[PDB]
């Protein structure tokens, strides 16, 4: 369930479950056998942060500072820590204002980006249009009976 | 997808049958086309002619001799060994409802989905008539593919010895327009569901063309400067020639 | 509220216009929404800076005929400017 | 004396993809249609002969696939008789070997009328056609020795050697022929068909072009900036002629997409 | 930024890093300029020899 949760990660529920249940998350039975609550909680909360990371650089165009730390629930030094590590890492793109004190997700887009995708909804409305003309003809069955 | 290619030998062959069999009082020709379906690209080297006789007023009622079927098939196999049979064709455009029953006769004999070839004897239309129809589950539903011409040695050579952008273009989108102008006004006279749910797809996907106009001029300047430098080298092309006729004259007035 | 906000170009809507639908504060409409928009019913996002939403055209919007006779009309505007600008092409 | 030989458009089509497909072999089909005394001969569909490795030989003709497909035919409209059959020889040009001509004189007795007609489907792809015809004695105009084929004009009698030394002398066994094709107003428009789905594709190599527009021009720019130099060493113009007419032709195209 | 190891442009007044940094166009001016300059040698030496 927690897979399907990726995209759609609010982080409600996140911390409430790191607080509380954690039958395979510090005690490993079957598989690693455990070794300490710091080994396997270090990287838990990275990946959590870099879940809702990814989902905003592909929905969200911007977002304010004040707004990062309610989600993440770290402080402002801590907000551009875990933002900045993705970026060199060739992962999240995102630009970051400070004087209007957002962020910036949306990536950029040349000249010739925008008439790409241009050339690719005029041919895909020729296959609506195609997908329609061969419709008439065989629903016309029905019309004619 | 897939893709149709037919070669102009199957597409004469299927408008030729109308006129030597003389068919009259709006039938329809029925024929077998022989090729390799299995590829990704349906080619049809071979077509024939098979005689077809359906009642106009009764749908119920079909004939279709399954002698030419095991004597076309015995036939191929002492000549080409690579031809089967991948389907059949008709002699109009517009379909009727006895495709499903004719599907049903060929589906033991044909080896792999049944191809239903749409060949227009008329030629009332705009550029390619002949459309080409992949019967599949739906209870069955068509799905239509592209329909090119196979590039051979073997069959356009021939064309050539019997024969010796945009403007067309735009007379095809005209084509498509007036069908869905006929589809809503015939719509409402019979009531006052594929079709509307893909029609409003096409105007939310040109008024929205006027949003990236601002975009859209940064490369048609592009093309007015790559044709700056192209008129610019033209002139050295006919400055080089009165040269090259000057140098003419004075060896005609030397001689 | 997306087909009330739709003009021509302009599918955009705002926090205000959501927070009296659902009577919800700012936060509760950014979770609401995206969820939806994960699931491939629409195309678009929220940006929280400015406070606009911008909506592509996904959903087929079943449930037609009051359309039917506005968008046969639209065909026919689309029929003329070909038509107009087709003859255009033929004698220059 | 020359002679026009009317074949319809179709039989050329399937007279061509037949011989051609296999090259070796030299492979064989009959023919049908009508005649109009004995001074035009009309084909109108063609009949394929099974395959034989003994290279038409008086062994490869079966009478009873003959004589069983053309019942068939009778019912899918074919009224006409046998007017003959085709020969293919692949690599040479139109004439008749020993076999061929024996081969030929085992049908005089049965159709008089048949027809042998040489086709060449390799060095006809040059956009004329090479093929010829050679018609048995029906008489009848004719009996011993008589002047038969009017219409006297266009080609010549070409063929190779053997066949050209005897003309009105023998006319039995051999003689030149020539080789007409007539059309309708309908036909011709049959095979006009390869110039909205031809839109979309005219589109298609302008849409992954809008990716490298920049790397395009660029290439082309540069190839000019090379071949202008090497005009400016030569104190040349065709290949920078050809490099520029390359690149009017697309930057009109992208200006049919707007 | 005069290194021209990292495109930028400071402010001293707000104490602040502009957005500076973007990319070039070929196939414009630069291979547009070079090729006209090299066609204007071409021309000089057509009306030299036309003499």
Same mark, same amino acid.
């Given at each position: ?145 | ?40 690209? #349906? &080619?049809? $080297? %071979? ?9 106009? !007023?009764?749908? *119920? /009622? ?102 010796? #952008? &945009?403007? $067309? %273009? ?9 069908? !869905?102008?006929? *589809? /809503? ?71 | ?92 | ?258 | ?51």
């Amino acid at each position: 369930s927690l897979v399907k949760l990726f995209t759609t990660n609010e982080l409600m529920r996140w911390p409430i479950v790191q607080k509380t249940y954690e039958p395979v998350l510090n005690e490993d039975d079957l598989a690693f056998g455990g070794e300490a609550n710091k080994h396997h909680w270090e990287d838990l909360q990275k990946r959590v942060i870099e879940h809702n990371l990814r989902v905003i650089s592909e929905y969200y165009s911007r977002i304010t500072l004040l707004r990062l730390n309610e989600l993440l629930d770290l402080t402002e030094s801590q907000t551009e820590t875990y933002i900045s590590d993705l970026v060199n890492q060739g992962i999240i793109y995102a630009k970051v204002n400070r004087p209007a004190k957002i962020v910036n997700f949306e990536k950029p887009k040349n000249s010739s980006q925008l008439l790409n995708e241009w050339s690719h909804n005029v041919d895909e409305l020729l296959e609506h249009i195609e997908t329609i003309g061969h419709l008439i003809t065989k629903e016309e069955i029905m019309h004619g009976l | 997808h897939e893709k149709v290619t037919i070669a102009p030998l199957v597409l004469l062959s299927a408008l030729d049958h109308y006129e030597r069999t003389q068919t009259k009082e709006n039938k329809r020709c029925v024929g077998v086309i022989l090729g390799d379906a299995n590829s990704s690209t #349906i &080619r049809v $080297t %071979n077509s024939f002619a098979l005689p077809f006789e359906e009642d106009e !007023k009764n749908s *119920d /009622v079909w004939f279709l001799d399954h002698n030419y079927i095991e004597n076309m098939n015995e036939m191929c196999k002492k000549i080409n060994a690579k031809e089967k049979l991948i389907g059949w064709y008709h002699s109009g455009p517009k379909l009727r409802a006895s495709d499903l029953k004719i599907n049903e006769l060929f589906k033991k004999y044909t080896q792999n989905n049944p191809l239903l070839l749409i060949v227009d004897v008329k030629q009332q239309g705009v550029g390619l008539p002949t459309d080409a129809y992949v019967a599949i589950e739906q209870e069955k539903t068509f799905l239509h593919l592209p329909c090119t011409i196979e590039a051979e040695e073997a069959e356009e050579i021939g064309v050539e010895h019997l024969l010796r #952008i &945009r403007l $067309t %273009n735009q007379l095809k989108s005209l084509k498509g327009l007036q069908s !869905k102008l006929k *589809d /809503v006004v015939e719509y409402l006279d019979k009531v006052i569901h594929t079709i509307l749910g893909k029609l409003q797809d096409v105007f939310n996907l040109n008024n929205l063309q006027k949003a990236l106009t601002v975009k859209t001029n940064d490369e048609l300047m592009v093309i007015y400067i790559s044709n700056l430098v192209r008129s610019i080298i033209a002139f050295d092309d006919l400055i080089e020639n009165k040269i090259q006729n000057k140098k003419i004259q004075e060896q005609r007035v030397k001689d | 509220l997306i087909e009330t906000v739709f003009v021509k170009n302009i599918r955009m809507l705002s926090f205000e216009d959501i927070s009296k639908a659902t009577h919800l504060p700012k936060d509760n409409v950014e979770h609401l929404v995206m969820r939806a928009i994960s699931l491939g019913l629409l195309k678009g996002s929220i940006d929280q800076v400015n406070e606009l939403v911008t909506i592509s055209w996904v959903q087929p919007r079943i449930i037609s005929g009051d359309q039917i006779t506005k968008m046969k009309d639209r065909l026919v505007e689309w029929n003329d400017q070909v038509e107009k600008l087709g003859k255009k092409m033929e004698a220059r | 004396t020359k002679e026009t030989v009317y074949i319809s458009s179709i039989a050329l089509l399937k007279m061509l993809k037949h011989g051609r497909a296999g090259v070796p072999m030299e492979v064989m089909g009959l023919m049908l249609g009508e005649f109009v005394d004995d001074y035009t001969v009309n084909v109108v569909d063609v009949f394929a002969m099974p395959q034989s490795g003994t290279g038409v030989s008086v062994e490869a003709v079966d009478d009873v696939f003959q004589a069983k497909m053309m019942d068939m035919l009778k019912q899918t409209g074919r009224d006409q008789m046998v007017v003959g059959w085709y020969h293919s020889h692949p690599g040479f040009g139109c004439w008749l070997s020993s076999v061929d001509v024996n081969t030929q004189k085992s049908f005089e007795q049965l159709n008089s009328r048949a027809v042998a007609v040489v086709v060449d489907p390799i060095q006809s792809v040059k956009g004329k056609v090479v093929i010829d015809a050679f018609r048995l004695i029906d008489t009848g105009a004719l009996i011993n020795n008589l002047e038969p084929r009017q219409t006297t004009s266009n080609t010549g009698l070409l063929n190779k050697a053997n066949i050209q030394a005897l003309i009105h002398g023998l006319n039995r066994h051999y003689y030149s022929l020539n080789i007409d094709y007539h059309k309708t107003a309908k036909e011709t428009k049959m095979l006009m068909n390869l110039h909205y789905e031809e839109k979309e594709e005219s589109n298609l190599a302008a849409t992954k072009s809008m990716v490298k527009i920049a790397e395009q021009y660029s290439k082309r720019i540069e190839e000019e900036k090379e071949l202008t130099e090497e005009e400016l060493k030569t104190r040349p113009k065709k290949h920078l002629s050809e490099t520029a007419d390359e690149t009017l032709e697309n930057n009109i195209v992208s200006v049919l997409t707007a | 930024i005069l290194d021209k190891i990292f495109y930028g442009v400071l402010d001293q007044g707000n104490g602040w890093l502009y957005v500076y940094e973007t990319p070039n166009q070929d196939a414009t001016y630069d291979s547009a300029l070079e090729l006209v300059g090299q066609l204007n040698k071409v021309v000089d030496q057509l009306f030299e020899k036309a003499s």
